[PDB]
Amino acid sequence: DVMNRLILAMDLMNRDDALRVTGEVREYIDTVKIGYPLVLSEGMDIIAEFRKRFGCRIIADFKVADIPETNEKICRATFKAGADAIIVHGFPGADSVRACLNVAEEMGREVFLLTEMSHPGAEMFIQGAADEIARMGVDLGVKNYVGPSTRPERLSRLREIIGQDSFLISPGVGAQGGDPGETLRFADAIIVGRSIYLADNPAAAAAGIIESIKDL
Amino acid sequence: VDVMDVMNRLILAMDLMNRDDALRVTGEVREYIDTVKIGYPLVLSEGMDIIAEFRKRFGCRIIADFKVADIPETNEKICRATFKAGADAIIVHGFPGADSVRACLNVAEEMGREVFLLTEMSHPGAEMFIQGAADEIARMGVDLGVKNYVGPSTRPERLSRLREIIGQDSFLISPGVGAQGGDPGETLRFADAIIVGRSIYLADNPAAAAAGIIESIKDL
Ligand SMILES: O=C1C[C@H](C(=O)O)N([C@@H]2O[C@H](COP(=O)(O)O)[C@@H](O)[C@H]2O)C(=O)N1
């Protein structure tokens, strides 16, 4: 359950700037997605902190895409650092995703499978494997997925593959071009990045987005 | 000669997760290699500063094995942060497409660092989707101006195919020799250097582990 179905993609690289725009919209969010831009430039402890300076839940968007052995070490350190869930790439195959799954289960945490990406280059290879990846995701027993809001049609097919009792979230809303309304029809929640943390007033953006979909 | 050469054609994949063991083990094999591959296992446990530290204390070049695989905008920040940390190079995935790779290349060009494109991976799972796109990712990397690549030693027939695609003038490094089954000798028929992790850092005696690989290759 994600408050207001919205997830903050705190992608600012300044620690303070981060805990700021994050505080300037704390009201409308309870789930934060944190990536490498912030973590590498400020350290993994920027996570265990968030889980207090804001009490929110943290999804580590690390797109794990290595061999099984290394994926296991990466997931361990991300969870030890105290992350609630970690986003994993599916293109490396089923043994690599399985490695992340074991660790999540061993530590009682969550794995999110990224099936398709939102950006343009995604057409070359990712798109043609998307469905097969989502399906691998089902054979593997994955219950959490990430899909592109930049492609409403794919987003609907994804929901068809994963089922109704699978959790789904969607990036690409706003800057990349996705609409917060169309997207929420198949996915359990959206993820908005730049469209918030870069507006003259981030507080008055994560307010309007909630308005454009406070109906549902 | 345009690309930096690797001492003894051997790159150490330092994936131990605690600062002291990483330092201790790397120090022991210093006289044998001058390039060190530092990935997320160490960097997420000890921090990115570990990158400048190794680079200073050992005088070795550092390849950040981060497998950048995000959208262009984010890949740019990951590369800028990695280079700001002092890495000499950064490994990038190709599957996300040409725009994602180009974003890494711009920053590398801007800051005077290098990009290695990972085309095909060495684990079994790699057969499911990356193998099928491997030749095209390689060819895509070539057309983008990529001069450094990573190909799998666990499949000489594939490493060979990739060498033909990228040609004789570009730099190819290959992981998977040792713990994964690749042979130092065969791999080097096509790769300029091999990446070795566990066979050295989980060995009773790392230096001997390294000296013994360097030895069986000395002739070839
Ligand atoms: O396919 C993907 C993978 C990844 C993800 O969601 O896992 N993201 C992340 O979503 C954020 C951009 O949202 P914004 O700033 O454009 O509004 C960044 O943190 C991206 O790395 C994508 O956008 N597309």
Ligand SMILES: O=C1C[C@H](C(=O)O)N([C@@H]2O[C@H](COP(=O)(O)O)[C@@H](O)[C@H]2O)C(=O)N1
């Ligand atoms: O295809 C790949 C991708 C990646 C890479 O080389 O970029 N690696 C890395 O090579 C090291 C293992 O060498 P060892 O410990 O098995 O000796 C780890 O750091 C892996 O993440 C692979 O092994 N296979």
